[PDB]
Amino acid sequence: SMEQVAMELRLTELTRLLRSVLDQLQDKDPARIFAQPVSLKEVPDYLDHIKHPMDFATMRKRLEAQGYKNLHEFEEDFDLIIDNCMKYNARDTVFYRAAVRLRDQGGVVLRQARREVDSIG
């Protein structure tokens, strides 16, 4: 149908906007602490602690399959990155501190993304 196409065009544009948001959030992680999944070879107990692991490469795979229907879904995944780290790592660690900084800096990016998504529909 023409409607399914129109729908698919909106998704594609959402994907375009989320790709830019993702690049901006990932620049706030210059140490690449959150770039890849926590290694189960190097942290063999990880899944005993963290039930839904997440990282920027995993988000990128979902993104490019147009797997985010709306901003709320994308934000859920970004919040997993931060919240998982803040539970697994203690407060006095470079990891926890990196998550706090990513959260704080990402807030600005995500604030304007929500306005853009509502604005452009």
Where do the domains of the chain lie? Answer: 1-121
When the candidates are 1.10.600.10, 3.40.630.10, 1.20.920.10, 1.10.630.10, the CATH number that belongs to 1-121 is 1.20.920.10
Spatial separation of the C-alpha atoms in residues 44 and 90, rounded to whole Å = 18
Q: Is the dihedral of CA 36, 100, 92, 48 positive or negative?
A: negative
Length of the chain (residues): 121
Could you tell me the resolution of this structure in angstroms? 1.7
Question: Which residues fall within 8 angstroms of residue 113, CB to CB, at 6 or more apart?
Answer: 17, 18, 21, 71
Q: What is the largest CA-CA distance in the chain?
A: 56
Spatial separation of the C-alpha atoms in residues 94 and 51, rounded to whole Å = 22
φ, ψ of residue 31 to 5 degrees: the values are -75, -10
Confirm if 74 and 64 have CB atoms less than 8 A apart.
no
Confirm if 105 and 49 have CB atoms less than 8 A apart.
no
